[PDB]
Each structure stands twice: as C-alpha cells, then as structure tokens.
Amino acid sequence: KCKDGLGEYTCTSLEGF
Amino acid sequence: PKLLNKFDKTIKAELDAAEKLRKRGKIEEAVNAFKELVRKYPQSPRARYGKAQCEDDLAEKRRSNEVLRGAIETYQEVASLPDVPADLLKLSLKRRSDRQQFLGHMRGSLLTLQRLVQLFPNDTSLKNDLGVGYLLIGDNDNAKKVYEEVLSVTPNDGFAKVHYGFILKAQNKIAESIPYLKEGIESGDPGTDDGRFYFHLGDAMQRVGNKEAYKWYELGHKRGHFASVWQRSLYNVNGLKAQPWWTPKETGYTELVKSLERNWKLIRDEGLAVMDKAKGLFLPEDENLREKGDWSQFTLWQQGRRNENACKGAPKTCTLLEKFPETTGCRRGQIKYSIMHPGTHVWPHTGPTNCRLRMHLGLVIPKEGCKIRCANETKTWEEGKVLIFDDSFEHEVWQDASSFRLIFIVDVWHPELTPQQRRSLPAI
Ligand SMILES: [Fe+3]
C-alpha cells in the first residue's frame, strides 16, 4: 500500500464499474 | 489484421452488416444480430468475437460487471473454436485479460496472459504485458524473470528497461536501477512516458548523490506528469490549492485543530501506554523511505476504516476523533502515532496524492535534533501544537536528538474537495 510514499506500481485497487 | 478465416470469408457480408450496427451505436441491435449469427454459424470465430465485442460495449453503457463477465467468457470462446486466425486469437484474449483486470480478477488476467505467451512464444510485447500482470498482483520476482528474458532477446526494449529498473529500485538496488530507468525513458518507446518512472529515477539519483535528479523532475513536470518540480504526487485532482505549509485558518478545520491541541496530553499518554505495554502494535515503516534509523507507526485509521484492535489500545483518542469525519473519512490518508529515534534520516520524498493535507500534533518532542523540511522551508515540532503541511510536496526529516520523538499524524481531506469527490475518489 501507498501510505507515506509511492513505492508500489499501483496504489489503487480496481473493482470494476 | 487478418481476422477472417476461410469460412468467415464466405459470409463476410453478413458479418460486416452486424459490425455496422455496432459501429453506429445500436448495441442492443448488434448483440442480437451477432447472437443470431452464432446460432446460425456456431464455429465462426468472427461472429463469436462480434458478440463479445457488443457485450463489451453494452457493459460500458450500463456500467454492469455481470454483463462484462459475460463478454469475458465469450472472448474465451473465440479461442476454443476451430481455425481461429492468429490475429483474432491475440485480440480476443488480450481484451479478455485487459477487462479481467478492470474487474480486479488479477489472477484471471495472469492466467490469460500466460496462455497468450505460450501460444505466441516470440511476441515480446506479450511477455511485457505479462510482466505488468505480475506487477499488479505484487509479484516483483516473477516480473523480474519476465523482463530479463525480454531484454535477453530484444536488448533495446524501453518498456522492459523502465519496468526492470522499477523492479530493481523497489528491491533497493538504487545504483543498478538508474541506467535502466534513464535509458528506458530516453528510448521514447510506447509506455515509457509515464510519471512513475520519472518519479523513481529522480529519487534514485537523489539517493546516490547525483544532482541531475531535478532535471528529470523538471522533464516530468514539462511533460504533464508532475504539477511542479516540488509537488510530484501522481494520484491527483487538478485545481486544488497547492502550498507546502498551511495554517489552521487556511484549512478551515479549526475545530479539529482546537480539539487536538486542547486534549493533546490525553493523546500523548495513550500512545506512551502502548509504547510501554504493547510495543508490538508499533510497526516499522515498510516503504524504504529511510536512509538509516528506526521509524515505527501505530495506525488507528487507514483508508477511512477504523482498526478495531488499535483503537482498543487508544480508546479515548479514538472517541475524540470520531467527531471529525474530515479525517476519519479520509479514504486517502491515515491517523497514526509515529515514533522516530535518534540517528534517523528520511530520504526526500512525496506522498501519493494531493487530495489530503497532513497534520502533525507534537507529543514528545526532544528540545534539539528534530526537524522537518517541506519544499524550501525547514520547521520544528512543538509539544501540544499542530503543524500542517501538504505531503504531496517533497519533504525530508531528521532525528538527531538524544531521545525518542513521538508525534500524532492526522490526515484530512483537502479543503477544496467537493463532498462528491470525497465519496467517489478511490482509496489510497
Ligand atoms: Fe510523508
């Protein structure tokens, strides 16, 4: 997860429409 | 692309007609027309592809996941039929994988891409797309093996370089990552002009001492990725006021601030009680933001969800914060205690989003050695006083005191965000 930084390739999670 | 096999050529007219109704925008009329063609010609790859494509479009109009699930199955049926042209086979399963990711069936997309790379062993672009699949599920080791193979076949693929460099940088191979990220961005290949790689190249350079980092920050800004050389967040809402340091009045969250400052000792004492009797609830920082030192955090709210167990350790503090949805409902921020010990230096970094502001309440502040820089100004904490900054700007922290430093971190929604944006924005 992206808490204090931005280390992940994606910080969000897709759940469709 | 060659999408019509021998049989589909004998019925091209009936196929182009249905494709016309889809291209015009009559989706409901086209689904029925491809459905009737599938009934008539059950082994036509193009007719099956057309039904899946109409279902794909219909799901978008309705915003239906159930309809999209159906298109995903129809896309696979195209690959089970006989004598499917290779261009059609690749298009059908790539779209299956793509739309499988939109629903969040990451493992399904991965399985689809694995099948694509086995059916077409010489298409490097597919292996590259498979490496993205592994990165989206959090498997940096398998993504590494893939891009290594791509670079062993096509050594000058920029997409593979940046992703390989991104992986190396995430593995703390800072010196080894710079050449792959820089060359990959300079390649100009499709998919290399992405803010993530500008962000991580400049940070890697900043860490090894190379002063060219700002040139890459500047390029990312000029190419629309960063809002400024200083504000380098990537999950942003455009238009929001942007300044490193904020005053309580500027935020409009005067009641929250007054409440934290009036009751600060209460928040301090519950955090010290956890330190003394429940130290394990403090978890080390796990984002590779430290050059050195010990930095641990005890999190009460994250992504707008209350940690029931943590609030049992700080019950009065949690009751206090319940009254302020501007922070408890900040699905892009946290509420946490944060402890930092002497000998700790946090690399210059930015947070992920511009949709929050970060409040620091000083709890246990050593008299000397502690400082926080945001942008071009360096400030210090004060016990019982709130400090407000936008962590989307580059900030750096030092802890060179003789004892520990405890603060309380409270993230709030950016004040200029509409109530609707505050309910729709995906969590971070
Ligand atoms: Fe931060």
Following DSSP, what letter does each residue of B148-193 receive, concatenated?
HHHHHHSTT-HHHHHHHHHHHHHTT-HHHHHHHHHHHHHH--TT--
Q: Which residues contact B179 (CB under 8 A, 6 or more apart)?
A: B165
C-alpha separations of B314 from B251, B267, B377 in Å: 26, 8, 33
In a domain, B233, yes or no: no
Shared domain for B188 and B145, answered yes or no, is yes
Q: Is B358 annotated as a binding residue?
A: yes
Q: Which residue has the tokens 């750096």?
A: B396
Contacts of B428 in chain A (CB under 8 A): 1-2, 11-12
Instruction: Let me know: does B163 contact B132? Beta carbons within 8 Å.
Output: yes
- Which CATH number fits the domain that encloses residue B310? 2.60.120.330
- Please state the φ and ψ torsions of residue B393, each to the nearest 5 degrees: -85, 150
- Dist. CA B8–CA B254, nearest whole Å: 69
Q: Which residue has the tokens 């429409």?
A: A17
In a domain, B1, yes or no: no
Q: Amino acid letter at B300?
A: L
Instruction: Let me know: does B108 contact B133? Beta carbons within 8 Å.
Output: no
- Return the closest-CA partner of residue B387 out of B356, B358, B355: B358
- Chains A & B: contacts with CB separation below 8 Å: 68
- Return the closest-CA partner of residue B15 out of B39, B33, B42: B33
Q: Which residues surround ligand 1, an ion (CB under 5 A)?
A: A 4; B 391
Last residue of a domain, one of B173, B188, B223: B223
In a domain, B242, yes or no: no
- Dist. CA B148–CA B306, nearest whole Å: 42
- Dist. CA B1–CA B5, nearest whole Å: 12
Of the partner residues A5, A7, A9, the one whose CB lies closest to the CB of residue B135: A9
- Return the closest-CA partner of residue B73 out of B91, B48, B46: B48
In a domain, B243, yes or no: no
Transcribe B1-24 into DSSP letters: -----HHHHTTHHHHHHHHHHHHH
Chain A residue nearest residue B100, CA to CA: A16
Q: How far apart are the first and last CA of chain B?
A: 40
Shared domain for B178 and B253, answered yes or no, is no
Instruction: Let me know: does B97 contact B116? Beta carbons within 8 Å.
Output: yes
- Dist. CA B376–CA B190, nearest whole Å: 35
Token pair of B74 as six digits: 């129809």
Beta strands in B270-353 (DSSP E): 283-284, 290-292, 295-302, 305-306, 334-340, 344-349
In angstroms, what is the C-alpha Rg of chain B?
27
- Which CATH number fits the domain that encloses residue B138? 1.25.40.10
Shared domain for B212 and B257, answered yes or no, is no
Q: Is B338 annotated as a binding residue?
A: yes
Q: Which residue has the tokens 């290399």?
A: B192
Shared domain for B218 and B255, answered yes or no, is no
In a domain, B234, yes or no: no
In a domain, B317, yes or no: yes
* Ramachandran bin of B352, using left for φ above 0, alpha for ψ from -120 to 50, beta for the remaining angles: alpha
- Please state the φ and ψ torsions of residue B267, each to the nearest 5 degrees: -65, -40
Return the exposure string of B273-302: e unless at least 16 CB atoms fall within 10 Å of the residue's CB, then b: ebbeeeeebbeebeebbbeebbbbbbbbbb
C-alpha separations of B326 from B92, B393, B413, B416 in Å: 45, 21, 6, 12
Transcribe B224-243 into DSSP letters: TS-SSSSB--SB--TT----
Of the partner residues B102, B199, B428, the one whose CB lies closest to the CB of residue A14: B102
Shared domain for B192 and B310, answered yes or no, is no
C-alpha separations of B224 from A12, B194, B219 in Å: 21, 10, 9
Task: Give Cα B309 to chain centroid, integer Å.
Answer: 27
- Dist. CA B142–CA B395, nearest whole Å: 33
Shared domain for B103 and B193, answered yes or no, is yes
Q: Which residue has the tokens 């300044």?
A: B243
Contacts of A1 in chain B (CB under 8 A): 302, 428
Shared domain for B211 and B66, answered yes or no, is yes
In a domain, B208, yes or no: yes
Q: Amino acid letter at B16?
A: D
Taking residue B405's Cβ as centre, other Cβ atoms within 10 Å add up to 22
Instruction: Let me know: does B315 contact B371? Beta carbons within 8 Å.
Output: no
User: Containing domain of residue B211, as a range?
Assistant: 6-223
In a domain, B344, yes or no: yes
Transcribe B351-406 into DSSP letters: -SBSSEEEEEEEEE--SSSEEEEETTEEE---BT-EEEE-TTB-EEEEE-SSS-EE
Instruction: Specify burial of residue B13 (Cβ count, 10 A radius: 0-12, 13-18, 19+).
Output: exposed
Chain A residue nearest residue B334, CA to CA: A3
Q: Is B48 annotated as a binding residue?
A: no
3-state secondary structure (DSSP) of residue A7: coil
Q: Please tell me the total count of domains within chain B.
A: 2
* Angle of the B124-136 helix axis to the B158-170 helix axis, nearest 10: 30
C-alpha separations of B72 from B2, B65, B120, B131, B331 in Å: 22, 10, 20, 21, 31
- Return the closest-CA partner of residue B110 out of B132, B133, B90, B79: B133
Relative to beta strand B305-306, strand B334-340 is unpaired
Token pair of B424 as six digits: 């729709």
DSSP B411: E
3-state secondary structure (DSSP) of residue B299: strand
Contacts of A3 in chain B (CB under 8 A): 287, 302, 334
Instruction: Give which of B132, B287, B407 to mutate to test A binding, by max A Cβ within 10 Å.
Output: B287
- Dist. CA B238–CA B119, nearest whole Å: 43
Shared domain for B95 and B191, answered yes or no, is yes
Cα of B214 to ligand 1 centre, how many Å?
19
Instruction: Let me know: does B232 contact B350? Beta carbons within 8 Å.
Output: yes
Q: Which residue has the tokens 């593979």?
A: B160
Shared domain for B213 and B263, answered yes or no, is no
Handedness of CA B25, B27, B30, B34 (dihedral sign): positive
Shared domain for B418 and B372, answered yes or no, is yes
The number of residues in chain A equals 17
Cα of B352 to ligand 1 centre, how many Å?
9
Q: Is B105 annotated as a binding residue?
A: no
Rounded to a whole number, what is the distance in Å from the CA of B348 to chain A's nearest CA? 10
Shared domain for B260 and B148, answered yes or no, is no
Shared domain for B40 and B185, answered yes or no, is yes
3-state secondary structure (DSSP) of residue B305: strand
- Return the closest-CA partner of residue B300 out of B310, B290, B292, B286: B310
